[PDB]
Structures are given as C-alpha cells and as structure tokens.
Amino acid sequence: LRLPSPEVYRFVVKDSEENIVFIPIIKGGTVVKLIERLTYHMYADPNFVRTFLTTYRSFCKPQELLSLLIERFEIPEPELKRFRKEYVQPVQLRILNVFRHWVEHHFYDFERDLYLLERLESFISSVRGKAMKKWVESIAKIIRRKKQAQITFESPPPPIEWHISKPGHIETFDLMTLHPIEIARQLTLLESDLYRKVQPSELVGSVWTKEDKEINSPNLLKMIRHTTNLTLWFEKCIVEAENFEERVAVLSRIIEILQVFQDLNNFNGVLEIVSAVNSVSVYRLDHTFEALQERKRKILDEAVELSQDHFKKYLVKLKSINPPCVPFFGIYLTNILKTEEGNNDFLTGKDLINFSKRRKVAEITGEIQQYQNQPYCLRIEPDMRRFFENLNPMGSASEKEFTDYLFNKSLEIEPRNPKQPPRFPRKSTFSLKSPGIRPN
Ligand SMILES: N#Cc1ccc2cccc(O)c2n1
Numbered sequence: 029l030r031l032p033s034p035e036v037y038r039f040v041v042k043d044s045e046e047n048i049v050f051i052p053i054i055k056g057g058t059v060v061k062l063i064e065r066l067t068y069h070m071y072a073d074p075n076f077v078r079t080f081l082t083t084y085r086s087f088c089k090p091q092e093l094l095s096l097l098i099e100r101f102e103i104p105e106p107e108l109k110r111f112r113k114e115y116v117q118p119v120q121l122r123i124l125n126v127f128r129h130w131v132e133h134h135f136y137d138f139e140r141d142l143y144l145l146e147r148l149e150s151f152i153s154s155v156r157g158k159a160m161k162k163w164v165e166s167i168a169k170i171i172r173r174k175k176q177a178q179i180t181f182e183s184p185p186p187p188i189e190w191h192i193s194k195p196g197h198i199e200t201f202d203l204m205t206l207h208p209i210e211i212a213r214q215l216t217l218l219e220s221d222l223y224r225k226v227q228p229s230e231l232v233g234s235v236w237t238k239e240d241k242e243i244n245s246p247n248l249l250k251m252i253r254h255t256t257n258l259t260l261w262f263e264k265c266i267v268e269a270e271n272f273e274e275r276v277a278v279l280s281r282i283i284e285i286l287q288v289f290q291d292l293n294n295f296n297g298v299l300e301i302v303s304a305v306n307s308v309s310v311y312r313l314d315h316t317f318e319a320l321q322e323r324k325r326k327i328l329d330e331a332v333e334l335s336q337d338h339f340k341k342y343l344v345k346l347k348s349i350n351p352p353c354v355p356f357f358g359i360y361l362t363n364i365l366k367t368e369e370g371n372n373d374f375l376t377g378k379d380l381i382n383f384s385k386r387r388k389v390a391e392i393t394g395e396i397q398q399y400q401n402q403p404y405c406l407r408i409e410p411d412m413r414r415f416f417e418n419l420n421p422m423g424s425a426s427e428k429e430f431t432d433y434l435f436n437k438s439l440e441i442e443p444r445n446p447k448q449p450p451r452f453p454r455k456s457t458f459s460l461k462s463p464g465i466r467p468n
Pocket residue numbers: 305306310311312313314315317318325328329332
C-alpha cells in the first residue's frame with residue numbers, strides 16, 4: 029504494498045521511459061527517479077551512492093539535494109504497520125546512510141556553504157525516531173570530527189642541495205642560482221600537494237569553466253594555474269636569455285631538472301617542461317637546441333616521445349613504476365572534456381538527466397584516486413616553497429599578451445633568416461656552471 033498517491037509523494041510514480049532509463053545499473057532519468065533509486069527500499073546500492081554523491085553537482089545543486097532527501101524522508105501514509113516497516117522504515121534508513129557518506133566523503137559541500145550544514149543539523153536533530161537514533165548520533169559524530177580539523181618522516185630524507193643561492197636569502201633565487209636537484213624536489217613536493225588536494229567533484233561538469241569556479245573547484249584551479257605559470261616561467265627563462273652561451277646553459281639546466289623529475293616519477297613536471305620546449309616561442313630556437321650535448325638532447329627526445337601518439341609511451345610508463353609519483357594531470361583533463369562534449373547532459377519522450385555521462389567522468393576521476401595517498405620522502409624547504417608558489421611571469425599582462433611577448437622576443441634572439449643569431453651582452457653575473465645531478 030500500500031503506497032501513497034503520486035499527487036502527494038512524487039517518489040512513487042510508476043517507472044517508465046518517461047522518467048527513468050536503465051542490481052540494475054541506472055543509466056539515467058528524472059532527478060525524482062534518481063533520488064528514489066539512491067534511497068531504494070528493496071535493496072541498498074553502495075556503488076550508486078558513491079557515484080551519485082561524486083557527480084550530482086553537475087545536475088543538482090547541493091541545496092536541492094538536501095531538499096529532495098527531506099522530501100523523500102517525509103512519507104505520507106496511504107488512504108499499515110507493514111508499510112511503516114517495509115517502506116517507511118527502510119527508506120528513512122537509506123536516507124540516513126546517504127547522509128553518512130555525504131558528510132564523510134564530501135564534507136566540502138558544507139564548508140563552502142555553511143547554510144547547507146545548518147539545515148542538516150536542524151533536520152537531523154528533529155528526527156526523534158526509535159531506530160533512527162543510532163544513525164542520527166553517527167552522523168553527528170562525523171560532523172563533530174570534521175569541525176575539529178580546523179613533520180613526521182619514516183625513512184631518512186635526503187639532504188637539501190644548494191648551489192649559488194645560500195639559504196635565508198629569497199632575493200637571489202633564480203633558475204640558475206638554485207640547485208637543480210632541489211628545484212625538482214621542491215617542485216615535486218608542491219605539485220604532489222596540489223595533486224592530492226584535487227577532489228573528484230572539481231572535475232565533473234567542467235565546473236572550472238562555469239561562473240562559481242572559485243568555490244566549486246578551488247584546488248583544481250590552483251593545479252592548473254601552477255602548471256600554466258611554471259610552463260611560461262620556463263619559457264620566460266629561455267627566451268629572455270639574450271646571450272647565446274647563457275641560453276644554452278639555461279636550457280641545459282632545465283633538462284637536468286627534467287632528468288631529476290624522471291627519477292622522482294614526477295611526470296607532471298616532466299611533461300610541463302615538454303610543454304615549454306614545444307611552445308611556439310621555444311620550439312623555433314633551432315640554434316639553441318643544436319648547441320646541446322648529445323646526451324642532453326637524447327634525454328629531451330625521450331621525454332617528448334612520452335606525449336607523442338596521444339601519450340602512448342606515457343601511459344605505459346605511468347603503470348610500470350611505483351609510488352611516490354605525480355602523474356601528468358593534463359591527460360586527465362583532456363579525457364574529461366572529450367566526454368563532457370561527446371555525451372549530452374540529458375537523455376530523451378521527455379528530458380531526463382543523463383547519468384551515464386556523469387559515470388564516465390567519474391571513471392576518469394577514479395584513476396586519480398590511486399596516485400594521491402603516497403607522500404614523498406623529501407624534506408620541504410620553506411624559502412624555496414614560497415618561491416614557486418609566488419611565480420608570476422606574466423606580471424600584469426594577460427596570457428595572450430605574454431605569449432605574444434615570448435614570440436616577438438624569440439624573433440629577436442634567433443631571427444627567421446639563414447643568418448647567424450647576433451650576440452648580445454649577458455645581463456647575469458653568476459656562473460653558468462651546473463653543479464650536476466649526482467647528490468653531492
Ligand atoms: N633544431 C632543433 C630543435 C628545436 C626544438 C626542439 C624541441 C624539442 C626537442 C628537440 O630535439 C628540438 N630540436
């Protein structure tokens with residue numbers, strides 16, 4: 029069975045292709061049918077709960093989800109006993125279990141929106157049922173743990189290598205003054221921490237391209253803005269080296285950073301350097317790449333081939349290693365955009381929420397889960413940490429204005445002619461000698 033009429037309880041409408049399309053794997057359907065399958069009385073679907081709470085923000089606002097769960101909780105009696113035990117009792121237990129996984133795995137919804145938590149804390153306290161008391165106290169315990177959150181080394185860390193810049197003096201920090209070993213170490217520690225803070229909800233629905241990008245995807249933007257700045261900073265250090273002898277040493281020093289990146293399995297930092305040497309302003313410096321050592325150019329050629337053929341050699345290299353590693357985060361964004369555009373957000377006699385598209389984007393984020401919980405055994409350097417955290421090569425100009433500056437500056441150092449590149453006086457004063465890659 030005896031169920032209420034759909035005129036007062038929308039979660040009881042008969043199933044059809046007008047509201048739901050297919051433990052049966054749910055392909056899609058109306059948001060009312062998705063909440064019913066999320067908190068179904070016949071059985072429990074733990075896999076559907078994890079995928080829904082991970083991708084629901086692309087088709088349902090967090091305030092809307094809590095309102096639907098409250099609507100699903102308030103069940104009216106038909107025009108019983110078994111109904112209050114075979115329908116009301118199981119459904120309300122399913123909703124509380126959804127409240128558990130929500131506040132446990134995706135508590136950031138309540139941090140970004142304090143009003144969303146205030147509504148839940150009042151609705152949870154208002155439930156004074158008998159069997160629901162244990163689940164209510166369980167949710168309250170999880171909320172208390174998340175509210176209280178606001179340098180141990182197992183193995184001996186390696187010593188911090190220094191070159192020309194002595195510690196405590198952030199002013200003289202540059203690409204050539206710092207030690208290339210520690211540059212790749214601190215960049216790996218920074219890229220690792222930025223990689224671990226990225227939540228799968230920040231990569232669903234292209235939310236970093238929407239309006240509220242600074243709220244929905246705060247960590248994803250910092251990972252992209254670091255990749256963008258570090259790639260342009262490498263290009264800036266190459267194209268601004270007007271002296272030919274200095275420009276070869278700078279490019280060689282970057283390859284030495286690429287080699288340490290390879291040894292640390294920081295493919296993100298590996299392919300960021302590859303993105304710099306393949307840029308429009310750096311790739312045309314044929315005379316600079318020609319003056320390299322025979323071993324330096326071979327190391328770069330191997331790193332470029334990792335990205336060739338849709339990262340075929342890279343995907344084989346990422347599997348055959350062991351953590352700690354920082355995988356290339358750009359290959360994940362590319363497969364997500366190809367799915368967000370190749371699949372429509374809705375299914376169609378009526379418009380239904382295309383849930384299978386959200387699942388595909390969830391499978392891409394699932395591959396990111398396995399490379400996060402494995403810290404590096406490298407000691408952090410505070411002065412060098414803020415140096416790469418505050419890298420801003422564009423200054424006040426946009427990326428289009430800065431890339432045009434890099435291309436016009438590239439035409440100055442190595443002009444487009446068969447003639448030799450002119451010699452410019454070196455503006456630096458330090459030594460162009462590299463300390464090497466072997467830890468000294
Ligand atoms: N001449 C030359 C030249 C120019 C750009 C390059 C970029 C990556 C690898 C290379 O070998 C390159 N060689």
